Design a protein around this nucleic acid. Structure first.
Ligand SMILES: [Mg+2]
Ligand SMILES: [Mg+2]
Ligand SMILES: [Mg+2]
Ligand SMILES: [Mg+2]
Ligand SMILES: [Mg+2]
Ligand SMILES: [Mg+2]
Ligand SMILES: [Mg+2]
Ligand SMILES: [Mg+2]
Ligand SMILES: [Mg+2]
Ligand SMILES: [Mg+2]
Ligand SMILES: [Mg+2]
Ligand SMILES: [Mg+2]
Ligand SMILES: [Mg+2]
Ligand SMILES: [Mg+2]
Lengths: 144, 102, 203, 210
RNA sequence: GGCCCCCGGCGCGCCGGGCCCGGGUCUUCCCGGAGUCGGGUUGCUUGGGAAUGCAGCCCAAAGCGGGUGGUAAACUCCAUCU
RNA sequence: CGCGACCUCAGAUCAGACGUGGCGACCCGCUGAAUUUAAGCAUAUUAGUCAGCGGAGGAGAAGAAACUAACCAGGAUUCCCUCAGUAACGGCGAGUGAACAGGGAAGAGCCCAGCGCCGAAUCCCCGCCCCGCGGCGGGGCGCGGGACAUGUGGCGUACGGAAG
């Protein structure tokens, strides 16, 4: 008899919805090591001549990691939380559905921590969280 | 004189002016914070109650409070710890009573 | 702030969710060998609380020890002597089972350094512990201050000298009136001081 | 066997004492080694005091010794805070600190801040770069006035307030010292039971009329 | 006392690069280690004596909480540490 | 109905490292007697000692209070003097037996996890170039691999801390 706190992770998103969710999530992947180097060098070149600081509107990005996502949920800063269904030490995320529901942030459970890892250029990710999003994707995020 | 400092009596001791100050930060240990209370309430509704805690609630439901305290003290171990645990178990019973009232 | 929730979760070992997880895991560990390397800490919050960091050089070994007391290993229960020493059963080992599991991990992996250990489950016949080991010659460990201490020669086989947290608990160390047996560093240190006759030059 | 009158003696030599006998033939050598280390340490910290940091004024705990005052482990943070010294700078300029010591009274507090202010006035501070004196001291008061200090810094000394002879007043003559001590002991002994008896009598009083 | 040879750590000017703001006041926030403590029992240990410490088994925490305050226990105040 | 990702495992005379065994006076963790004394002897004593097993270093262990106290309070550890053959334990017999305060030797303090903030800021490996060799480091480069969000680094730890 599996307790509901552990059984809830068997209810994952359907293949159709998980496809729209990951297709949207592909637009907000964290920048890789290579394109961070390219961005940082461009800032050094631009700072040298001649704009200066130039924050240039740090773009929205997908926040990843159970500790990062938990704080965002506790601060009501996350707009959407995606939880992998197969976290092998299943204590890292058992509180997250209840915590997300308590704080009012919508949450879904998706198939595969490996798919979340490819979103963040890593092997595995427990959870990813959607913070503020670009205007052209506000309609898409609302439907999800 | 009429009265002298004494080594004995209710007011015994050498007389010094007490230096009042803020207590040390280690004395703050054990205080419940707003965030830690929130976390513990989260885990409680995720987890539930231990089987002995549920049994003690059945005793408190039928108002066998002395028997409930005997049971809790036998489980937890000491009278002081049992009294605190019985108050909390009584509080959750009262909380779910008024929740079901509305 | 997820580590706070996992900590409070593991303090509820008799809940339905934790009872299920502990039973299933204890079954799985029962199917493996007595000494077995774990790919990752089962309790990442408890591991890092005890000194573990998710970097190269830290390894985890799951150890299974047999529960119960220490039967006196004499043939046919004959302890030839006075009746005060006739005891064979109901005898207890001075060191805890956690200290024994640490010793078994350290003896097998003699090239590593035992850091700490923690409880992951128990049966009626077995207790399961996960031991944190450190490779003292990995460059991640060796090039880092605040970790270079484990690389010193004096810190080899801490678990066999009672220097880990589990092994320290049986030595009777501490401050104050409850721990007068070990003033001087150990029981033997206190006993030698209290049983040595100081014969000064001028008596 | 006992023989006539004598003291009943209990030697503790039943436990193979001859394996653990500490002779002291290295005592003169130990004193030489300790003296050499003291002299080497003094040379290493060349103008700094040989004994080490200044220690606070500290009263001895129990009722046997509370009339005496000695040197403590270090100055409390409350003392340093009101003396205006940073708790991390103090150890650099030769001030021992004790973060775990509290100040129950104000007299011991103020006694130790005058000790810190006196030490701070008597301190000669050398600049980090001798060619660049930033804020330490003038060269005049450190060219020749700098000298390694022998013995404890400002050694802690018991002081007695001498009272001049005075004419005994009649109130002092009529004071009953033995009677006051006997009554004070009785009052402390019966204080709890007197309150309970008054409490019980108050309970009977508030319902005596019905 | 002399001469010879080798090795090691002390200040100055320069060298190659790192090296990043400190204090006081006020305001707003944040604060802790769990099969662990503790309890029962058993065995050993201690000067520790209605049980000093250690361990096995069973129970099994809290957060104005917990531990200690050398006589077991209830209530109460205080002290001290964390 | 095969191809990928991850997880959990396996093999290799894979690349590079590490452990084993000796000594063991001193030190640390266990295990652990009986002779002996009690004019017998069983608890006790011998003794947490001999023997036995393991593990170190030039010292080790301990160590910065879940301390002592009850005072007008002291303030990590270790060692010496004293407390003291005392409080206490004990067929309360034989016997055993500390600690606090005090005076000295020495004196030194700190770090994480957690809570948080910072675009993982972090680390290992491999090739290339330069400065060096003497214990193999410094600097730069690689749309070079890997670790790592199941949490690296910086700030920060109960003496409070952070941000304005
Ligand atoms: Mg015997
Ligand atoms: Mg009492
Ligand atoms: Mg090879
Ligand atoms: Mg060896
Ligand atoms: Mg005999
Ligand atoms: Mg005889
Ligand atoms: Mg031996
Ligand atoms: Mg050491
Ligand atoms: Mg240590
Ligand atoms: Mg501390
Ligand atoms: Mg005497
Ligand atoms: Mg003895
Ligand atoms: Mg001295
Ligand atoms: Mg961190």
């Amino acid at each position: 008899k599996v307790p509901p706190a552990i059984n809830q992770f068997t209810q994952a998103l359907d293949r159709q919805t998980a496809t729209q969710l990951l297709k949207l999530a592909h637009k907000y992947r964290p920048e890789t090591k290579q394109e961070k180097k390219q961005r940082l060098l461009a800032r050094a070149e631009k700072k040298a001549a001649g704009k200066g600081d130039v924050p240039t509107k740090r773009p929205p990005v997908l926040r990843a990691g159970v500790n990062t996502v938990t704080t965002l949920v506790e601060n009501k800063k996350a707009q959407l939380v995606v939880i992998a269904h197969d976290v092998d030490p299943i204590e890292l995320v058992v509180f997250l559905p209840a915590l997300c529901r308590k704080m009012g942030v919508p949450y879904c459970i998706i198939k595969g921590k490996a798919r979340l890892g490819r979103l963040v250029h890593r092997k595995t990710c427990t959870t990813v969280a959607f913070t503020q999003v670009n205007s052209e994707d506000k309609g898409a995020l609302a439907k999800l | 004189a009429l009265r002298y400092p004494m080594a004995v009596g209710l007011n015994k001791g050498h007389k010094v002016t007490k230096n009042v100050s803020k207590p040390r930060h280690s004395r703050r240990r054990g205080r419940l914070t707003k965030h830690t209370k929130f976390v513990r309430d989260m885990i409680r509704e995720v987890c539930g109650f231990a089987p002995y805690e549920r049994r003690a609630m059945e005793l408190l439901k039928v108002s066998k409070d002395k028997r409930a305290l005997k049971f809790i003290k036998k489980r937890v171990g000491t009278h002081i710890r049992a009294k605190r645990k019985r108050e909390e178990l009584s509080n959750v019973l009262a909380a779910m009573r008024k929740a079901a009232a509305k | 702030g997820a580590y706070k929730y996992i900590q409070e979760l593991w303090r509820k070992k008799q809940s339905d969710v934790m009872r299920f997880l502990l039973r299933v895991r204890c079954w799985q560990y029962r199917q493996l060998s007595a000494l077995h390397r774990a790919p990752r800490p089962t309790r990442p919050d408890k591991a890092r609380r005890l000194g573990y960091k998710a970097k190269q050089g830290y390894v985890i070994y799951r150890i299974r020890v047999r529960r119960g007391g220490r039967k006196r290993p004499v043939p046919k229960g004959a302890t030839y002597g006075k009746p005060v020493h006739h005891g064979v059963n109901q005898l207890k080992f001075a060191r805890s089972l956690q200290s024994v599991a640490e010793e078994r991990a350290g003896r097998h992996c003699g090239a590593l350094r035992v850091l700490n250990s923690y409880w992951v489950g128990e049966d009626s016949t077995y207790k399961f512990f996960e031991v944190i080991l450190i490779d003292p010659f990995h460059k991640a460990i060796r090039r880092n201050p605040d970790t270079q201490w484990i690389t010193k020669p004096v810190h080899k086989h801490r678990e066999m000298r009672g220097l880990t947290s589990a092994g320290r608990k049986s030595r009777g160390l501490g401050k104050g009136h409850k721990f007068h047996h070990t003033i001087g560093g150990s029981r033997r240190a206190a006993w030698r001081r209290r049983n040595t006759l100081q014969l000064h030059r001028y008596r | 066997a006992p023989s006539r009158n004598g003291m009943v003696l209990k030697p503790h030599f039943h436990k193979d004492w001859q394996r653990r006998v500490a002779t002291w033939f290295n005592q003169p050598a130990r004193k030489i080694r300790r003296r050499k280390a003291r002299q080497a340490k003094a040379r290493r910290i060349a103008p700094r005091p040989a004994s080490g940091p200044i220690r606070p004024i500290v009263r001895c705990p129990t009722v046997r010794y509370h009339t005496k005052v000695r040197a403590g482990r270090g100055f409390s943070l409350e003392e340093l805070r009101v003396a205006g010294i940073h708790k991390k700078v103090a150890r650099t300029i030769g001030i021992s600190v004790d973060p775990r010591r509290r100040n129950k009274s104000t007299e011991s507090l103020q006694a130790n801040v005058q000790r810190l202010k006196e030490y701070r006035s008597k301190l000669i501070l050398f600049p980090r770069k001798p060619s660049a004196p930033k804020k330490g001291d003038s060269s005049a008061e450190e060219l020749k006035l700098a000298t390694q200090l022998t013995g404890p810094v400002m050694p802690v000394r018991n002081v007695y307030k001498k009272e001049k002879a005075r004419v005994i007043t009649e109130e002092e003559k009529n004071f009953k010292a033995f009677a006051s001590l006997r009554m004070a002991r009785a009052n402390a002994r019966l204080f709890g039971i007197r309150a309970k008896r008054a409490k019980e009598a108050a309970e009977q009083d508030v319902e005596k009329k019905k």
